[PDB]
């Protein structure tokens, strides 16, 4: 699913773990109902855009690891709906037999 | 079913008037599976009927249901080619059930106030045969009587 689209996603993962998995203090702690509500809260949201557009974990689409398909994802397996099926009935996901109740 | 001759399910008696005839009537009146709302209306109707009529409930419901009961109904078979009116003697299980539908179907219309009022007034008119349900039986006879030429 486009090697550029797969390769631009590695920036999104690597660069997010750098900034906002550490510098969420800029938005969370500072922008709060307390004594910093005056210019300190203004300088927070001002400085929050100085950061790159990426880094925000909302910008991560969360696509399949094998193929790179954006849609049809499953968080348990980290795979697309097609590749989980191909892998399940084959012997790769442990315990994942066909359900029938 | 094409060749699957199986019987029907058993029903249950209504606590306050433990029988069968009016137990079916609750079921035909019931909308959206709400037997709690429907069964309260039938008791409210038959109590208001028994007050006015000066009878019990089962015999009050009977002298009413028989007055809207079809003797013969009209089918139409094409045996040979053409389509014509063939009357047939209705079966005893369907006979009284087809009557209970015509009482309730009439009571959908005739917007008095409440459902308990409307069924009471329909069964009251059925006792003195001058409602809508008796007219629907009357018309059903007129077809069988007029189209009696076809066996």
């Amino acid at each position: 699913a486009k090697q550029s689209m797969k390769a631009r996603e590695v920036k999104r993962v690597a660069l997010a773990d750098k900034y906002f998995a550490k510098r969420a203090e800029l938005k969370a702690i500072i922008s709060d109902v307390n004594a910093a509500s005056d210019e300190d809260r203004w300088n927070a949201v001002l400085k929050l855009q100085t950061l790159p557009r990426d880094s925000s974990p909302s910008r991560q689409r969360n696509r399949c690891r094998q193929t790179g398909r954006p849609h049809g994802f499953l968080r348990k397996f980290g795979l697309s709906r097609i590749k989980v099926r191909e892998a399940a009935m084959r012997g790769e996901i442990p315990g994942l037999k066909k359900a029938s109740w | 079913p094409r060749r699957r001759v199986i019987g029907q399910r058993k029903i249950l008696p209504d606590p306050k008037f433990g029988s069968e005839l009016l137990a079916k009537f609750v079921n035909i009146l019931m909308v959206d599976g709400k037997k709690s709302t429907a069964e309260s209306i039938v008791y409210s109707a038959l109590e208001t009927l028994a007050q006015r009529s000066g009878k019990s409930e089962l015999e009050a419901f009977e002298v009413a249901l028989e007055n809207v009961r079809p003797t013969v109904e009209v089918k139409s078979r094409r045996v040979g080619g053409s389509t014509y009116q063939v009357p047939v003697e209705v079966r005893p299980v369907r006979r009284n059930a087809l009557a209970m539908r015509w009482i309730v179907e009439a009571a959908r219309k005739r917007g008095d106030k409440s459902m308990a009022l409307r069924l009471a007034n329909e069964l009251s008119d059925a006792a003195e045969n001058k409602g809508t349900a008796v007219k629907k039986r009357e018309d059903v006879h007129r077809m069988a009587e007029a189209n009696k030429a076809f066996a």
């Binding site: 399940a88 009935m89 442990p94 037999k97 359900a99 | -």
Partner: protein, 98 residues
């Protein structure tokens, strides 16, 4: 006391794992209640079976996570050390808790 809880995917791999952990504890240094079962977690997944269109057609999968408890009611010196460094049983997760 030590509440030992252990879970797995196969229903008939965990049985000998629960049998051997109890026997290497009951026999070596006494005391055991038994294999307390607990409810099974059945995480279901309903994926689309085709690669394009055909929404009606799907396959349904599940993963039975079978739990088990052990529950000993005395901190025995022979038993407590037999739990550590002496488990094995692959495909069966185990979590000892004091």
């Amino acid at each position: 006391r030590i509440r030992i809880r252990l879970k797995a995917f196969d229903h008939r791999l965990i049985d000998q794992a629960t049998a051997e952990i109890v026997e290497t504890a009951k026999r070596t240094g006494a005391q055991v209640r038994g294999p307390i079962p607990l409810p099974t977690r059945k995480e279901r997944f309903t994926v689309l079976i085709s690669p394009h269109v055909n929404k009606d057609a799907r396959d349904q999968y599940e993963i039975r996570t079978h739990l088990r408890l052990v529950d000993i009611v005395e901190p025995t010196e022979k038993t407590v050390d037999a739990l550590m460094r002496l488990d094995l049983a692959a495909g069966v997760d185990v979590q000892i808790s004091l």
